[PDB]
Amino acid sequence: GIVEQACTSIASLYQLENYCN
Amino acid sequence: FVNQHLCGSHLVEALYLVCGERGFFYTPK
């Protein structure tokens, strides 16, 4: 998931927004 | 806080900033 992918790859705004409530 | 590698607590801070009043879910796998 994002926790693993965001450390090894550039995290985007869209990726982050997907985890907002 | 965006368009960079976000390891550990750096991801938590980015979600806090991005999501604002909505809050967020932080879920390691």
Swiss-Prot record, chain B:
Q: What is this protein called?
A: Insulin B chain
- Outcome (variant: residue 10 to D): In HPRI; Providence
> What's the gene?
INS
Task: State what changing residue 24 to S does.
Answer: In HPRI; Los-Angeles
Q: What domain of life does the native source organism fall in?
A: Eukaryota
